[PDB]
DNA sequence: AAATTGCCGAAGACG
DNA sequence: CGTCTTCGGCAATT
């Protein structure tokens, strides 16, 4: 039953090929545009992130995330209040002549300025694209992404995400995050935390407005590693190892949410990342590959449903990397919203998930 | 040195 | 289930 739904969600190779060919042409052209002289973003490098590059994208290959990461040396971070995720950015000594001089605000590096110039450079390059149907989606507050809309003639979106790369140690609000010691282990955890961290220009929402200079922590690179290296046994899902159903559970939960979101706008505040975060905790909670045997698919899905409902009910979903940050706090999602999503989930759970059709 | 090339894991396709 | 395939990611190389 759940296998038959997975078959439907599975992407088709001809679709992948058609989408990939077009997406790669467009992105590689922006990247090189960004590589150009006079640009502030001259040293940006590409990093592919998100559902598609983690092999957890469902239904159609119609959404692509790409991080244009910029190695910015020597930055001091100041925690924006006690959020743990959001930050103001200063430089240690002024870099003499600085490519990012123009994005400054006294001593603070404005995310809004830097994104706006990034967006402007992308918009100008996209207008020059003639062989392909592409446009830049209207800017949306609360988004670090400059979003492309491609008609291939299939509708494809590409989120291009400016990121600052910092090679220093991770900010202390992450110090008790990534609790993978009993699962992927301490060598993996330590090694992952020796990798750079990223800031993306998603602004903290003060109240009714955004704080235009703030940045947000991104662990999209770390998450991608984990999705590809997700078992306690090194050979999980390898050619001389056992297949598990961890990713299949993520896809089923992703689908259940996306179906509910399509017809209920009371659910607009929720999104895939809530689901991904929840399954990260599941994987931590049940680290043994044996617990995610494909034959146990139904009960792993139901256990994930159960955990998620409990997160809704208690209004608490800890960010996996930043445990202070509650993705289900009253302040980000109203109680009523969470209670709405609960009853719909419970209903689909006690009725054999009719919405899967 | 920006771009090509070589390698192979992840996973779709098919019997 | 096995085998074949395309895509993605890496970094050595020219
Ligand atoms: C609600 C949400 N949070 N979120 C998110 N919060 C983070 C905090 C710290 C680090 C990464 C985060 N990603 C995140 O990626 C989303 C969804 O991704 C979005 O771009 C988005 C947009 C509208 C609603 C929900 C989301
Ligand atoms: Zn596995």
Residue numbers in the entry: 149 to 505
From the paper:
cGAS has emerged to be an essential protein for the innate immune response to cytosolic DNA given its activation of Sting by the production of cGAMP. The generation of cGAMP by cGAS requires that the enzyme bind to dsDNA and use its two substrates, ATP and GTP, to generate the cyclic dinucleotide. Our previous structural studies have shown that upon dsDNA binding, cGAS is activated through conformational transitions resulting in the formation of a catalytically competent and accessible nucleotide-binding pocket for generation of cGAMP14. Here, we report the discovery and characterization of a class of compounds that binds to the catalytic pocket of cGAS and inhibits its dsDNA-stimulated activity.
We were able to solve the crystal structure of RU166365 (hereafter as RU.365) in complex with cGAS and dsDNA, allowing us to better examine the structural basis for the affinity of this inhibitor. RU.365 occupies only one side of the cGAS pocket, as does cGAMP in our previously reported structure, leaving the remainder of the pocket filled with solvent. The benzimidazole ring and a part of the pyrazole ring of bound RU.365 partially stack between the guanidinium group of Arg364 and Tyr421, which represent the key intermolecular contacts between RU.365 and cGAS. The angle between the pyrazole ring and phthalide ring of bound RU.365 is approximately 120°, which is mainly caused by the interaction between Cys419 and the hinge region of these two rings. The remaining parts of the phthalide ring face the solvent and form no interactions with cGAS. The benzimidazole-pyrazole and phthalide moieties of RU.365 overlap with the adenine ring of ATP and the α/β-phosphates of GTP, respectively. The entire RU.365 molecule overlaps well with the AMP moiety of cGAMP, with the benzimidazole ring of RU.365 inserting deeper into the pocket than the adenine ring of cGAMP. There was not a large difference between the affinity of RU.365 with and without dsDNA, both being between 64.1 nM and 98.5 nM, respectively. We found that the affinity of RU.365 decreased in presence of GTP or ATP (64 nM in absence of GTP vs. 298.2 nM, in the presence of GTP, 104 nM Kd in the presence of ATP). Taken together, RU-365 appears to impede the binding of both GTP and ATP to the enzyme active site.
